[PDB]
Design an enzyme around this catalytic site. Structure first.
Site, PDB file in Angstrom:
ATOM      1  N   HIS A  64      16.780  10.566  19.034  1.00 41.33           N
ATOM      2  CA  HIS A  64      16.941  11.719  19.962  1.00 41.33           C
ATOM      3  C   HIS A  64      18.243  12.515  19.674  1.00 41.33           C
ATOM      4  O   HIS A  64      18.333  13.623  20.203  1.00 41.33           O
ATOM      5  CB  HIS A  64      16.772  11.276  21.424  1.00 41.33           C
ATOM      6  CG  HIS A  64      17.900  10.489  22.002  1.00 41.33           C
ATOM      7  ND1 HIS A  64      17.787   9.140  22.291  1.00 41.33           N
ATOM      8  CD2 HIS A  64      19.116  10.871  22.456  1.00 41.33           C
ATOM      9  CE1 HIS A  64      18.922   8.709  22.821  1.00 41.33           C
ATOM     10  NE2 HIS A  64      19.747   9.752  22.933  1.00 41.33           N
ATOM     11  N   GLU A  97      13.320   4.452  17.579  1.00 44.11           N
ATOM     12  CA  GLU A  97      14.461   5.230  18.150  1.00 44.11           C
ATOM     13  C   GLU A  97      15.725   5.061  17.306  1.00 44.11           C
ATOM     14  O   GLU A  97      16.815   5.454  17.804  1.00 44.11           O
ATOM     15  CB  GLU A  97      14.727   4.837  19.607  1.00 44.11           C
ATOM     16  CG  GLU A  97      15.533   5.852  20.413  1.00 44.11           C
ATOM     17  CD  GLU A  97      15.044   7.296  20.403  1.00 44.11           C
ATOM     18  OE1 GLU A  97      13.849   7.517  20.151  1.00 44.11           O
ATOM     19  OE2 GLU A  97      15.863   8.190  20.633  1.00 44.11           O
ATOM     20  N   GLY A 104      26.551   9.715  27.843  1.00 41.66           N
ATOM     21  CA  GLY A 104      27.731   9.596  26.960  1.00 41.66           C
ATOM     22  C   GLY A 104      27.783   8.267  26.208  1.00 41.66           C
ATOM     23  O   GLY A 104      28.626   8.140  25.307  1.00 41.66           O
ATOM     24  N   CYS A 118      25.067   6.740  24.539  1.00 43.17           N
ATOM     25  CA  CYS A 118      23.991   6.557  23.525  1.00 43.17           C
ATOM     26  C   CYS A 118      24.639   6.434  22.149  1.00 43.17           C
ATOM     27  O   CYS A 118      25.585   7.204  21.874  1.00 43.17           O
ATOM     28  CB  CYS A 118      22.932   7.655  23.570  1.00 43.17           C
ATOM     29  SG  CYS A 118      21.866   7.484  25.027  1.00 43.17           S
TER      30      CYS A 118
END
Length: 182
Positions: A41, A72, A146, A148
């Site tokens: 992402h 991911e 904040g 990730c």
């Protein structure tokens, strides 16, 4: 404060950079040579900022399992003039549960941040922001925006990177040794 935080610190001081994309600022784990990981992402493009320096992306691969399900994790090769310390020997070989993990973050917003998150469950399947996702680790801490890309460690192992939360739990994508064989 103890041997969990010591290992976590040793990883942050040598094996992290601050990565910036059009989707924000992320903790980015360097694994070996010029190869690093970031949450998919982050939407890594042709150019990324590494510690506020314009850097060409030589390669970027959004990992999926053999059923074509999102993991991911994006593996990024950076056009950087310096290699990371090789930490592939700290990566688990198989999916597992863990005790006494630490989540470590380093950004402009959150410098030198360490969180003892406790027990880590092999959760497996998660609908993450509407995307079916596999190989998810879960810990019971109220992780926030904040965090990730934050590194999940136990003593002696780098087990995952933080990819989301639901207000009460946090979720990490597994790092496995077999992602980084060359």
């Amino acid at each position: 404060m103890g041997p969990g935080f010591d290992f976590a610190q040793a990883i942050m001081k040598k094996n992290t950079v601050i990565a910036r994309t059009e989707k924000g600022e992320f903790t980015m784990l360097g694994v070996y040579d010029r190869v690093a990981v970031i949450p998919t992402h982050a939407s890594v493009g042709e150019i990324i900022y590494i510690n506020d320096v314009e850097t060409r992306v030589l390669d970027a691969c959004a990992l999926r399992d053999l059923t074509d399900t999102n993991l991911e994790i994006t593996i990024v090769k950076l056009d950087r003039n310096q290699k990371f310390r090789d930490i592939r020997h700290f990566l688990p070989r198989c999916e597992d549960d863990y005790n006494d993990a630490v989540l470590s973050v380093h950004t402009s917003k959150f410098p030198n941040m360490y969180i003892p998150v406790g027990q880590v469950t092999n959760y497996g399947f998660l609908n993450l922001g509407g995307t079916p996702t596999h190989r998810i680790l879960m810990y019971n801490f109220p992780t926030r925006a904040g965090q990730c890309g934050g590194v999940v460690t136990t003593t002696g192992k780098v087990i995952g990177i933080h990819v989301g939360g639901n207000g009460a739990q946090g979720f990490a994508a597994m790092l496995l040794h077999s992602y980084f064989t060359d």
